Design a protein around this ligand. Structure first.
Ligand SMILES: COc1cc(C(=O)Nc2ccc(F)c([C@]3(CF)CC[C@@](C)(S(C)(=O)=O)C(N)=N3)c2)ncn1
Lengths: 112, 366
């Protein structure tokens, strides 16, 4: 199993990013996929989950209406479209499945 | 998550296992699910069966999705085959939201749903390693940990000997008094732990400690009895017979083929020594006769059985203890259960520390 996230960056408030996660070493098309985030000094926070065929999606109340989870099973890729970003969204975002996680991608939202 | 809301979230139907109420699908269907620390799949009845009242009808759930494959699980005594899918689940006694999980819906089984049993599914809380068809099938607890933002810890108390509690995400202080002692998880599959010694009425069995771990020693809420490898079983029986102040037990009593009937001080305590996180120390979990001479003239069955494989710390022993499955820190905790009391007497004890200088550094075969 391998998970590798990308697409993070440093954005202004109201900005946007599109996170990706490349998967290998298991049947991606059969896997529930989840995005989590973790900022220093804060608790781990569930972001969103997507069922294996993509039709069932769930979101944390903190991101509802701003972030959208999606997947391309043919390309073994999970996505997180992030809009209307706020300083409080700053975190490492990571993908997790069956007790494994990727190393993550940093999202920083700052007016500076 | 609310741990106090999880207190008494298990029902136990008197020697038949502890189960949790779970709501599955949209709209929700209520099932009764056996809590099983010895397996790793979430599986439920999907069709009618003679010995269940209800099952999960996937056709009535708008959110259910089929993965397009089946799974067959075979145990020593039985088996089942089910479709593998995904659906939303709620645990009303503890959580206020739903979670997307894998679910196996059983369509055929052999010797799995038995008569007079109140559950219609199983919740496997062991590690990904054991999940079928493979470890990539995300386990229920792995889904919950992530999606519910709980720590990677759960704990279990069984109060049937004196219902019970499954605390998902931590430890509820009101369920124990005194100290929690921790033993390392040697291998993350089953909850495999290292047994150093068994003592009957204060006398050690004088077996090589490898005899206690040869296949494996595990903590399993889905096993009824304390199951001991044959050589260990034989030694226990010989020690209990020697220590017990009654004239004699039949051979049939020991094998479970005969009950002993009467119209307690005459039977020994049984202690299991577990290594502490500091390897020079151990602690002991002790059960009184009331936990292994089990009511069924009042008649009793022996609460210990032989194994052709593992040493299983099943419900016989777990009825005495609040057991912490601290996956995050690779350890299993024990504290004596306040609810494990009969006729005003505690029926379990825990104590320590004791030296391990008289045993090898590794009692697991290597
Ligand atoms: C006090 O009364 C009871 C009754 C039960 C009970 O009925 N348990 C059960 C029933 C059916 C079944 F199928 C399983 C499996 C499910 F994987 C298989 C067998 C295995 C022992 S195992 C390591 O061989 O997988 C276990 N832990 N769980 C368990 N448990 C605990 N106390």
């Amino acid at each position: 199993v391998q998970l590798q996230e990308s697409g993070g960056g440093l954005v202004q408030p109201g900005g946007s990013l599109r996170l990706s996660c490349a998967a290998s070493g298991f049947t991606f098309s059969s896997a529930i996929m989840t995005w989590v985030r973790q900022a220093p000094g804060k608790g781990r926070e569930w972001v969103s989950t997507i069922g294996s065929d993509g039709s069932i999606t769930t979101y944390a109340d903190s991101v509802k209406g701003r972030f959208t989870i999606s997947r391309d099973n043919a390309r073994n890729t999970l996505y997180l479209q992030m809009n209307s970003l706020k300083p409080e969204d700053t975190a490492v975002y990571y993908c997790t499945s069956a007790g494994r996680r990727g190393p993550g991608t940093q999202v920083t939202v700052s007016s500076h | 998550a609310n741990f106090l809301a999880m207190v008494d979230n298990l029902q136990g139907d008197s020697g038949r296992g502890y189960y949790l109420e779970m709501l599955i699908g949209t709209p929700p269907q209520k099932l009764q699910i056996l809590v099983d620390t010895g397996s790793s799949n979430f599986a439920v009845a999907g069709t009618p069966h003679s010995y269940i009242d209800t099952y999960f009808d996937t056709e009535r759930s708008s959110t259910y999705r089929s993965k397009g494959f089946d799974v067959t699980v075979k145990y020593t005594q039985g088996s089942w085959t089910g479709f593998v899918g995904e659906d939303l689940v709620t645990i009303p006694k503890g959580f206020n939201t739903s979670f997307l999980v894998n679910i196996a819906t059983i369509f055929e089984s052999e010797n799995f749903f038995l008569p007079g049993i109140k559950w219609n599914g199983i919740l496997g809380l062991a590690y990904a390693t054991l999940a079928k068809p493979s470890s990539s099938l995300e386990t229920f607890f792995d889904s919950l940990v992530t999606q519910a933002n709980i720590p990677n810890v759960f704990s279990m108390q069984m109060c049937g000997a004196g219902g019970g509690s499954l605390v998902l995400g931590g430890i509820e202080p009101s369920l124990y008094k005194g100290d929690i002692w921790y033993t390392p998880i040697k291998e993350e599959w089953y909850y495999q732990i290292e047994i150093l010694k068994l003592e009957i009425g204060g006398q050690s069995l004088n077996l090589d400690c490898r005899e206690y771990n040869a296949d494996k020693a595990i903590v399993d809420s889905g096993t009824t009895l304390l199951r001991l490898p044959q050589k260990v079983f034989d030694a226990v029986v010989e020690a209990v017979a020697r220590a017990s102040l009654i004239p004699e037990f039949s051979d049939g009593f020991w094998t479970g083929s005969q009950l002993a009937c009467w119209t307690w001080s005459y039977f020994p305590k049984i202690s299991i020594y577990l290594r502490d996180e500091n390897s020079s120390r151990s602690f002991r979990i002790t059960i009184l006769p009331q936990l292994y001479i089990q009511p069924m003239y009042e008649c009793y069955r022996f609460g210990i059985s032989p194994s052709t494989n593992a040493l299983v710390i099943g419900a016989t022993v777990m009825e005495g203890f609040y057991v912490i499955f601290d996956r995050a820190q690779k350890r299993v905790g024990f504290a004596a259960s306040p609810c494990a009391e009969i006729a005003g007497a505690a029926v379990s004890e825990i104590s320590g520390p004791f030296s391990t200088e008289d045993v090898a550094s590794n009692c697991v075969p290597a």
